[PDB]
Amino acid sequence: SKARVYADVNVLRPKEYWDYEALTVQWGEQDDYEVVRKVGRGKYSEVFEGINVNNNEKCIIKILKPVKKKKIKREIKILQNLCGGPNIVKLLDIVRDQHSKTPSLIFEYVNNTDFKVLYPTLTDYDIRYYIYELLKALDYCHSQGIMHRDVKPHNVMIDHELRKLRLIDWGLAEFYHPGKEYNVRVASRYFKGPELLVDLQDYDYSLDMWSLGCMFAGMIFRKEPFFYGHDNHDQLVKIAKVLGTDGLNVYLNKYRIELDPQLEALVGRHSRKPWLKFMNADNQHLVSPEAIDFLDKLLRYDHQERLTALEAMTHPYFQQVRAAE
């Protein structure tokens, strides 16, 4: 398998662009940034609102939990490469504690409106707007030859007050190289593509589009998460109960994958459940044929069949967002 777009980005660029292990970190001043208040956690980190003591500017302080040198270089390089594309978090500085050597990444200040409280109040328009803004971030990073690999509500930081969106936490992200076989232990369960769940290692940018599809499905249907599985096996079962086992079987044949017998047993036999069957009185004001047409083209077993981020932005669903933009 290979990506249908931007396959050759890291083929044509200098090796220095993607060769993150060769990076040597320029450590800034640890004392320049003070913790003001804890604001949350990333995947392998604790995150704080901070202040730059030189100019009193707000910042984000991301203190990383102990991890391998390779992994920190990967995040830092990807962040330097993507500074400052549309709706990407801005890495400002990298510092560390002299004694314990625990590193901190410093970002431009990002405010956070809790998604669990925010999503119920989004209007039909707001969902078109914010997904479009997310799509800009994704098209940009894909065009720079990077997959995010952990798209989810928490990693899409919305400031509803100021109507800003930031794609955050690039700690699971990777450079795309055609044919390369990746670790499937990425993303978060509810937002893991079928490729990850069936051990298809040579995946690409299209992984992020499944994850967005899952977020978009949860928004319009107000069912969150949309696919609510307990473990990785059950997460596939939940997908198969909506999309149907027939489409799964043609997908597994196409890429020549055999399911583990226990997983195959757990998956079983299911019919496709039309998207319209998820509509109810709570979400009717959000579900339109354009929303469903868009969702349908995102939640596809076959990663090659999914809309690219660039294609998605031009779908008539976002027509009013473009026209206003």
Ligand SMILES: O=C1c2ccc(O)c(O)c2C(=O)c2c(O)ccc(O)c21
């Ligand atoms: O801004 C980030 C932020 C900015 C860049 C990151 O890499 C990141 O993980 C976070 C982050 O985890 C975070 C959070 O967990 C809670 C509130 C936040 O404002 C953030």
